[PDB]
């Protein structure tokens, strides 16, 4: 009914990038980009993030160049009007897995795997929702048998979601030897997605702290200035020739 329609509510996890002075865990961003490339890029797309966005955030410039040179993209017409494919450079966006929305829906049973660039800002309680969605592939309750071709997921609105349980224990081999479990993989991929949706978070937080402090000092000065200018008026004595 309405409860299943709106989905089981998502808790409030203590994300490492939460707090007025808190930064992304950049090692976790690197790990999340690894897991996204390994398992999530088959169906989902980003299409808003360039390879150059990873330089200085999770990978070094030569590493990003090699990773871009791995894939090949179609480049515009040459001197004969024909089209051709060249290895991706440091400016190309992440590759798209499907030709278009129609091909995506056809490959995924009519359901369109959403673009993941702004996924954590396109859902209410974004980061917690995404983590809970990925981790909470539970056994459906009693007498609610869902149709074939879907999977039960309490957090998803309606309970029935179209993507299968992807994050499995030992799905990927992390570069730095971190033991890959479902929860760890979910944490890393959600950290990566939250960075992707908001790459300016650290600069924004630093600016906010500095300017709130500075403007607080300005507010004290402005209050003193106003009191000083008004003190010849507020501490004045007037005689008016009237009683009642």
């Amino acid at each position: 009914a309405d409860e299943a329609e709106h989905g089981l509510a998502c808790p409030s996890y203590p994300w490492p990038h939460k707090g007025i002075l808190s930064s992304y865990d950049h090692a976790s961003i690197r790990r999340g980009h690894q897991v996204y490339t390994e398992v999530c890029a088959s169906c989902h797309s980003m299409s808003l993030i360039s390879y150059r966005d990873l330089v200085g955030v999770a990978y070094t410039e030569e590493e990003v160049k090699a990773m871009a040179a791995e894939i090949e993209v179609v480049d515009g017409p040459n001197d004969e009007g024909e089209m051709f494919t060249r290895p991706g450079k440091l400016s190309d966006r992440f590759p798209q897995p499907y030709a278009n929305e129609a091909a995506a829906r056809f490959a995924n049973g009519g359901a369109y795997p959403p673009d993941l660039s702004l996924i954590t800002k396109a859902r209410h309680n974004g980061q917690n929702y995404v983590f809970s969605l990925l981790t909470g592939y539970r056994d459906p309750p009693a007498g609610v048998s869902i149709r074939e071709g879907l999977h039960y997921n309490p957090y998803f609105p309606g309970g029935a979601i179209a993507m299968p349980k992807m994050l499995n224990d030992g799905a990927v081999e992390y570069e730095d030897g971190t033991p890959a479990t479902e929860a760890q993989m979910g944490k890393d991929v959600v950290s990566f997605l939250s960075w992707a949706a908001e790459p300016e978070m650290e600069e924004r937080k630093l600016m906010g702290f500095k300017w709130i402090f500075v403007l607080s000092l300005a507010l004290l000065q402005a209050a003193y200035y106003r009191r000083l200018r008004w003190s010849v008026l507020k501490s004045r004595k007037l005689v008016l020739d009237v009683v009642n």
């Binding site: 950049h26 690197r30 200085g56 999770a58 570069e175």
Partner: protein, 59 residues
């Protein structure tokens, strides 16, 4: 007093006052920026980009 001393220094001509205001703005902004940077680096140890173990091992 220190206030009277600094007044007799930099509060007799307006040009010197405006130059002092600009210099103080620059210096104070730099000082606050350094302090906030130190605070941020202290609070987020380990999470920086420069100190991840596999920064140059993909090659």
């Amino acid at each position: 007093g220190i206030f009277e001393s600094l007044y007799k220094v930099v509060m007799r001509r307006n040009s010197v006052y405006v130059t002092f205001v600009i210099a103080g703005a620059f210096l104070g902004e730099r000082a606050v920026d350094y302090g906030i940077h130190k605070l941020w680096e202290a609070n987020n140890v380990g999470k920086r980009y420069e100190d991840i173990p596999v920064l140059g091992q993909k090659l």
